[PDB]
Amino acid sequence: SFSGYLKLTDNVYIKNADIVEEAKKVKPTVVVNAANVYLKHGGGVAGALNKATNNAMQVESDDYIATNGPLKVGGSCVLSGHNLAKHCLHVVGPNVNKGEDIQLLKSAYENFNQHEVLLAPLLSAGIFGADPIHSLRVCVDTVRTNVYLAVFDKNLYDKLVSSFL
């Protein structure tokens, strides 16, 4: 079970944590990856989760892409969670640095509603370029299932909690 989280709403919780370390500790049913459409887990959360699986996530992902083609921005797929979780829900939030529509962030968060409980990062935050305060707002206003958000950056976590409406 999840420990040390601050409750933001009925169903959204938040913690200043490294999502890889959190996943290894909890071994949740679902860990969300901040994926791109190609499932190329190079950096940010995706690079870190993939490195923790010894690249097994990338090998599985390349086979998934070879069979199915790329995901849509705002879409997702369920793959193995490897040593981190039962499943990994790869969700593609819009990458504002690639000129993608920020309105797709709500569509991206809607994927979380297919799972009762998830360990997740803030979608489109970090190297995806969106405002994490906005991502948290969209998360709380979209996700209805139980989401445990791991925010790596302490200063960002404090800003998110202190500005939460």
From Swiss-Prot:
Query: This protein's superkingdom?
Result: Viruses
**Effect annotated for changing T29A:** In strain: Mu/B.1.621
From the UniProt annotation, give the residues forming the signal peptide. Answer: none
Q: What is the protein's membrane topology class?
A: Multi-pass membrane protein
Annotated catalysed reactions = Thiol-dependent hydrolysis of ester, thioester, amide, peptide and isopeptide bonds formed by the C-terminal Gly of ubiquitin (a 76-residue protein attached to proteins as an intracellular targeting signal)
Q: Where in the cell is it found?
A: Host endoplasmic reticulum membrane
Which intervals hold domain Macro?
1-165
Q: How is its activity regulated?
A: Inhibited in vitro by GRL-0617.
Per the entry, what this protein does is: Responsible for the cleavages located at the N-terminus of the replicase polyprotein. Participates together with nsp4 in the assembly of virally-induced cytoplasmic double-membrane vesicles necessary for viral replication. Antagonizes innate immune induction of type I interferon by blocking the phosphorylation, dimerization and subsequent nuclear translocation of host IRF3. Also prevents host NF-kappa-B signaling. In addition, PL-PRO possesses a deubiquitinating/deISGylating activity and processes both 'Lys-48'- and 'Lys-63'-linked polyubiquitin chains from cellular substrates.
Q: How does it assemble?
A: May form homohexamers. Interacts with N protein.
Protein name per the record: Papain-like protease nsp3
Give the originating organism: Severe acute respiratory syndrome coronavirus 2 (2019-nCoV)
Q: Give the encoding gene's name.
A: rep
